[PDB]
Design a protein around this nucleic acid. Structure first.
Ligand code: SAH
Ligand code: ZN
Ligand code: ZN
Length: 834
DNA sequence: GAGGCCGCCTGC
DNA sequence: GCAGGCGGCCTC
């Protein structure tokens, strides 16, 4: 009711006199106290905030600054959240004291000084541990920022964080050269923490500028002819026009300019920073020259051509800084330079767009002259053959002692690639129990890891139940494989590592209305871990495959919570849907490159083009490459050292019938079972594959052009399935027309890869009749080999697999692609520094 | 055995 | 509307 200032006003401003205390209804209030408020726009019952400032206005009104908390129910957590728990957020605002509903108790819960070694009345008392970022779903440690002489009156973490953020992202001119008739020339500018100078290079969107070389529009493909429905009875199911793994809609990688001039104008006597122009020399990517794509197949993805072509461009369009060097200017070798840091390109020649020839670069294209990092001791659970820890190893952040893998062939393979790790094949529940019970070793004399040994913990838990392909996920098997993530969390609790990584399939975020996700995040929060989740697309990290994977990252209290890696390669946009919705809110990762990227998309050609031809059933585990690496990608995976022998280029031996089918799948992109002819085929011995027979009306699909029926079963007519309607050994598989109408016509089954395209998600057993079925070679009539699958996953050719062909396929299919793991690992490395 | 057969699927 | 996709289960 009545509000009155208690005490002497501190630091009186011009329009404000700030106070540290006030009285409302006999109750005493002070800065740092917390308070309740009732919202007007609320579907949410209550608001809670800290009082940062108490000033009175010259308008006579009496004000305070509110730094809002967030209730765990308003975070990704939701109803799983602890009801007493609040999080700090970047919401704050000025408000009239009249609005305070009450004074509430809010306590800060710090991670214990012993935190690492743990994990074995009052109408209500609120608490907070972590600061929440609503946009990225990041739970991070509170800022350490402290108030001082001038701050103590208005000090607000939200305000500060906002001021720093918009200060850092706003464009500013650093150095000025000369003013002429209103135009200012600048030597130095900055935005978003990056400093740009004359002579630096810059990433622009593909649309920023064009090249003197122009691309040709010409004639689109006219219908080659009407199809013959008698011969090709299932072709009509192709009306969609969508080609799985097509690269046609893939964006171009960034344009790259070299900065020659920088200018802007003036506004109100001062330089207008909001508008800054850059004048650039354009670089050509090889595919931008007349050579186009088919002339660039063999070039380094980071090689450019210098040109004197210029363009003017807006600063605001700059996507970031990159390094471009003249090869001969290099103190080190080109490989060493390319491998030494991100955003690194080079050029040897220059491109004349007029003459279409390559020249030594002009003198002005030349540059002037014209800490041992300790590896985290890592424990890899559900290690598989080791893809994930292989990626971490390439990133130099981890040395993996202790892998746990239950499936023997995978553990063997891990061992073969990891001479220095103790690999336990036990059930992880059992092992955890053993170490919990005080055991130093296991029956085999393998030393168990103990609290303090494990710095980093990582793994993919079984994805079989979480997979959207799994019809039976509701049964006992899939559920059993589901409790394992809780087991993994138990490891995290017990060992309390500095860094935590959990990987799974994308569907892991949507499963059981996102309950799994919510519960594991809640778990990590209870433990006191900084954490976050996100979905990454492997393709954006340099393999030619669509693999969308859920990644959950946690960091111990003392650490810095890593960020998800920014995409390196462009990739087809439909295959890029990375957002997740939980409880009606949309969440995205910290990732800012939504359209383009620094490197061109890695292709199927780039992946397997060097592999010797083989037939269905090839069993030769060691055969010579006959040839050199044909691509950048192949060069990266084959190494530079003499290595004449190609391993695992074997492929499954498919039945005579399946092999005839494969033989009749056309080579063209988007080819699959729907292109099969309906014809009789002589199989092995006296076995004959008879035509498929259509004896039922399909009430949905109607009659063919010829007038034939389209049904293979009575269910086509809305009647119940009749067994004995089932036809055997037909070229066109009976079951596909059977259920096609509710399966999207089983697109991709017996499908081919295309050279210019990418692989569909590489699974544990390539099967042309499997739900993910375009496993055919772009050319040869056979399923992809183990080597080819390994390549699709970005494994080095030297990585060893163990067991029979199905075993190796499964080890490959299960793995986190090393390039993805490498990217994530580099983010972690970023945290290890500072 | 590994291949024929497949969800009142999910998700934007 | 239609495209995704470390699949499981039952047996030629
Ligand atoms: N109960 C259990 N205890 C320990 N390991 C198990 C297990 N159940 C399944 N596994 C194993 O966990 C493995 C996960 S495969 C994951 C591979 C890894 N992420 C990589 O990059 O290579 C499977 O191969 C499976 O055999
Ligand atoms: Zn504020
Ligand atoms: Zn039927």
């Amino acid at each position: 009711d009545r509000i009155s200032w208690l005490g002497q006003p501190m630091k009186i401003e011009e329009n404000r006199t700030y106070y540290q205390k006030v009285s409302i209804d006999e109750e005493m209030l002070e800065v740092g106290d917390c308070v309740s408020v009732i919202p007007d726009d609320s579907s949410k019952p209550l608001y809670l905030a800290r009082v940062t400032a108490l000033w009175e206005d010259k308008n006579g009104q009496m004000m305070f600054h509110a730094h809002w908390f967030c209730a765990g129910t308003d975070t990704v957590l939701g109803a799983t959240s602890d009801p007493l728990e609040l999080f700090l957020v970047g919401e704050c605002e000025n408000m009239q004291l009249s609005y305070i509903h009450s004074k509430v108790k809010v306590i800060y819960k710090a991670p214990s000084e012993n935190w690492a070694m743990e994990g074995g009345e009052d109408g209500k008392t609120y608490f907070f541990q972590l600061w929440y970022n609503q946009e990225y779903a990041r739970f991070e440690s509170p800022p350490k920022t402290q108030p001082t002489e001038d701050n103590k009156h208005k000090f607000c973490l939200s305000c500060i964080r906002l001021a720093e953020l918009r200060q850092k992202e706003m464009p500013k001119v650093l150095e000025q050269i000369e003013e002429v008739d209103g135009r200012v020339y600048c030597s130095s500018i900055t935005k978003n923490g990056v400093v740009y100078r004359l002579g630096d290079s810059v990433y622009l969107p593909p649309e920023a500028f064009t090249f003197n070389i122009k691309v040709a529009s010409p004639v689109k493909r006219p219908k080659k002819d009407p199809v013959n429905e008698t011969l090709y009875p299932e072709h009509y199911r192709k009306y969609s026009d969508y080609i799985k793994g097509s690269n046609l809609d893939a964006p171009e990688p960034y344009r790259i300019g070299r900065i020659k001039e920088i200018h802007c104008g003036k506004k109100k006597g001062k330089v207008n920073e909001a508008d800054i122009k850059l004048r650039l020399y354009k670089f050509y990517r090889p595919e931008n020259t007349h050579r186009s794509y088919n002339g660039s197949y063999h070039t380094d993805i980071n090689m450019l051509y210098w040109s004197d072509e210029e363009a003017v461009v807006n600063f605001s369009d700059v996507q970031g800084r990159c390094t471009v060097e003249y090869g001969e200017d290099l103190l080190e070798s080109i490989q060493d330079y390319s491998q030494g840091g991100p955003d690194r390109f080079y050029f040897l020649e220059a491109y004349n767009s007029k003459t279409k020839n390559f020249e030594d670069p002009p003198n002005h294209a030349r540059s002037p002259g014209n800490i041992k990092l300790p590896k985290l001791r890592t424990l890899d659970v559900f290690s598989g053959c080791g893809g994930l820890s292989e990626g971490f190893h390439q990133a130099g952040i981890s040395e993996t002692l202790w892998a746990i893998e239950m499936w023997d062939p995978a553990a063997q393979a891990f061992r073969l690639n990891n001479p220095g790790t103790t690999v336990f094949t036990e059930d992880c529940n059992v092992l955890l129990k053993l170490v919990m019970a005080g055991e130093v070793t296991n029956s085999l004399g393998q030393r168990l890891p103990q609290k303090g040994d494990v710095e980093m913990l990582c793994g993919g838990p079984p994805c079989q139940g979480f997979s959207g392909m799994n019809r039976f996920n509701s049964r006992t098997y899939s559920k059993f494989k589901n409790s394992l993530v809780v087991s993994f969390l138990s490891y995290c609790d017990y060992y309390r590592p500095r860094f935590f990584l959990l990987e799974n399939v994308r569907n892991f975020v949507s499963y059981r209305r996102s309950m799994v996700l919510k519960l594991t995040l809640r778990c990590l929060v209870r433990m006191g871990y900084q954490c976050t989740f996100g979905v990454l697309q492997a393709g954006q990290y340099g393999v030619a495959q669509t693999r969308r994977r859920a990644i959950i990252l946690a960091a111990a209290p003392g650490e810095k919570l890593p960020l998800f890696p920014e995409p390196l390669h462009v990739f087809a946009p439909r295959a890029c849907q990375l957002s997740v919705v939980v409880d009606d809110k949309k969440f995205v990762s910290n990732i800012t490159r939504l359209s383009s990227g620094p490197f061109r998309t890695i292709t199927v050609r780039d992946t397997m083009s060097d592999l010797p031809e083989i037939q269905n059933g090839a069993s030769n585990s060691e055969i010579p490459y006959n040839g050199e690496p044909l691509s950048w990608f192949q060069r990266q995976l084959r190494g530079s050292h003499y290595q004449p022998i190609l391993r695992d280029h074997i492929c499954k031996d498919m039945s005579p019938l399946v092999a005839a089918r494969m033989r009749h799948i056309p080579l063209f992109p988007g080819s699959d079972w729907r292109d099969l002819p309906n014809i009789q085929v002589r199989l092995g011995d006296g076995v004959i594959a008879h035509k498929l027979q259509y004896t039922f009306h399909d009430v949905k699909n109607g009659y063919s052009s010829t007038g034939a029926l389209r049904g293979v079963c009575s269910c086509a007519e809305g009647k119940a399935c009749d067994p004995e309607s089932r036809q055997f050994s037909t070229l066109i598989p009976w079951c596909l027309p059977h259920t096609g109408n509710r399966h999207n016509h089983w697109a991709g089954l017996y499908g081919r890869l295309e050279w210019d395209g990418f692989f569909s998600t590489t699974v544990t057993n390539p099967e042309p009749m499997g739900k993910q079925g375009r496993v055919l070679h772009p050319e040869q009539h056979r399923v992809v080999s183990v080597r080819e699958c390994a390549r699709s996953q970005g494994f080095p050719d030297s990585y060893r697999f163990f067991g029979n062909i199905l075993d190796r396929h499964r080890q490959v299919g299960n793995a986190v692609p090393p390039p993805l793991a490498k990217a994530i690992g580099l983010e972690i490395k970023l945290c290890l520094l500072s």
